[PDB]
Curated annotation (Swiss-Prot):
The gene is pth. The active site is at 22 (proton acceptor). It is an enzyme of class 3 (hydrolase). This is Peptidyl-tRNA hydrolase. Gene3D superfamilies: Peptidyl-tRNA hydrolase.
Amino acid sequence: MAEPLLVVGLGNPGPTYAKTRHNLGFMVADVLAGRIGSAFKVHKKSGAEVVTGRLAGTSVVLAKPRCYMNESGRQVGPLAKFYSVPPQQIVVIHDELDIDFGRIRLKLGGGEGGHNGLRSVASALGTKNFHRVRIGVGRPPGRKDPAAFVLENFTAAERAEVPTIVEQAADATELLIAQGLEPAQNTVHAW
């Protein structure tokens, strides 16, 4: 009827760290907005920025937070009620330390493996279990801090494959609308 897909990208506007391994969450949003050709406008209330469009046959709302990890969690809450969301589906792209760098892990709702945003957004609305997009960041480091390793975007092979995996990630996000969950994840893990 008129229910949109709520896409929250875990990627806050940070001058230098928006280009690092932790930009995965923001990548999908930026890419979708990029292919559609629209910029996200500031919602003068919570300080977040959202862009509107249509993916496949459903309204897509790409929402990114103002700043800070904790803030991002409660960013989704007042916004979903702000425009009054008809619950179609909520997609939240985030970092995943347990998954190999370059591939997508799809789980329903909240779970371990990520840091803050993915966990916070679940409690902000109270409704989860849809599509929580986990982009593998590689593996836990042996020397530097795990999060610091996500702050340094350098690798051997997969470091060059970023554009490829990001385009597919954003593209598969639309497939989650048109196809579903099971045949969709099958498509994602077939390559």
